[PDB]
């Protein structure tokens, strides 16, 4: 084609909740481009609702953002960069974004999936039974385990016996919490107990420790 659009390689963009995101869209055109007579429109739709809405409409003479703070800048366009910036991205803004460019009579488009993730914060509730509460994470998938390091065997051992993890619960802001319980008793002195939280938003597991 004479007119093409390239989005993020692979089709998916992941971003931390509340960060300022830039969703890529680069224009390729085989003939000289009049950026003042071109049209760029960004659309959004939830991954479960086929309802699609406009996020930003650019026309050489004028521009309109439908989601506040959203911007495609004329200066980036000079290098064919039609990327959309969304300051302070929210969980509800995850889903699929379509970039559509029109250079009459041609039209080109590209789509990308935006995934917004929130990292869990974890805390121990030690006041027989000990708890570990992880909170404010998104998506719901999470793996909570417990491990222990004793003096006699100085290496982590995962505790599978006597661990009951409660249901994942919903927060009004759209994130989730989950609490895991460790039952003890018959223990050696100086053992370090650890609640280990694994989630997609985490680059490394979150570990919270305590001794008795």
Ligand X SMILES: *[C@@H]1O[C@H](CO)[C@@H](O[C@@H]2O[C@H](CO)[C@@H](O)[C@H](O)[C@H]2NC(C)=O)[C@H](O)[C@H]1NC(C)=O
Query: In this chain, which of 1, 52, 64, 87 binds ligand NAG, going by CB under 6 A?
Result: 87
90 binding ligand NAG? (CB under 6 A):
no
Gap between the Cα atoms of 46 and 41, Å rounded: 17
Could you identify the residue written with the tokens 């409409």? Answer: 57
Nearer to ligand NAG, 39 or 111 (CB): 39
Read off the DSSP letter of residue 55.
E
Could you identify the residue written with the tokens 């390239």? Answer: 6
Partner from ligand NAG, ligand X, none contacting 36, C-beta within 5 to 8 A by type: ligand NAG
Read off the DSSP letter of residue 91.
G
Nearer to ligand NAG, 129 or 207 (CB): 207
In whole angstroms, how close is the CB of 124 to ligand X at the nearest point? 12
Chain residues binding ligand X by CB under 6 A are: 133, 135, 169, 171, 177
**Binders in 2-41 for ligand NAG, by CB under 6 A:** 19-20, 34, 36-37
Nearer to ligand NAG, 45 or 102 (CB): 102
Tokens of 201: 């938003």
151 binding ligand NAG? (CB under 6 A):
no
Gap between the Cα atoms of 142 and 133, Å rounded: 12
Nearer to ligand NAG, 111 or 124 (CB): 124
Gap between the Cα atoms of 47 and 91, Å rounded: 12
- What is each CA distance from 187 to 35, 130, 166, 195, 196, in whole angstroms? 72, 14, 24, 17, 20
Nearer to ligand NAG, 113 or 149 (CB): 149
Angle, CA of 196, 198 and 200, to the nearest 5°: 160
In whole angstroms, how close is the CB of 61 to ligand NAG at the nearest point? 8
Partner from ligand X, ligand NAG, none contacting 177, C-beta within 5 to 8 A by type: ligand X
Are β-strands 106-117 and 12-16 bridged in parallel, bridged antiparallel, or unpaired?
Answer: parallel
Residues near ligand NAG (CB under 6 A): 19-20, 34, 36-37, 87, 194, 207-209
């Amino acid at each position: 084609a004479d007119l093409k659009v390239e989005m993020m390689a692979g089709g998916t963009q992941i971003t931390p909740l509340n960060d300022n995101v830039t969703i890529f869209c680069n224009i390729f055109y085989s003939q000289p481009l009049n950026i003042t007579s071109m049209g760029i429109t960004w659309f959004w739709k939830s991954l479960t609702f086929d309802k699609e809405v406009k996020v930003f409409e650019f026309f050489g003479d004028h521009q309109e953002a439908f989601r506040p703070g959203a911007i495609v800048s004329p200066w980036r366009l000079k290098s064919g960069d039609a990327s959309l910036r969304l300051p302070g991205i929210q969980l509800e803004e995850a889903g699929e974004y379509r970039c559509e460019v029109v250079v009459t009579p041609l039209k080109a488009q590209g789509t990308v999936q935006l995934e917004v993730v929130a990292s869990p914060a974890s805390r121990l509730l030690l006041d027989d039974k000990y708890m570990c509460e992880s909170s404010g994470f998104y998506p719901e998938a999470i793996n909570i385990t417990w491990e222990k390091q004793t003096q006699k065997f100085p290496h982590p051992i995962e505790i599978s016996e006597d661990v009951i993890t409660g249901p994942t619960i919903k927060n009004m802001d759209g994130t989730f919490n989950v609490t895991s319980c460790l039952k003890l008793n018959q223990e050696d002195p100086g053992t370090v107990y650890q609640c280990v939280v694994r989630h997609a938003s985490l680059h490394t597991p979150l570990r919270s420790n305590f001794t008795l």
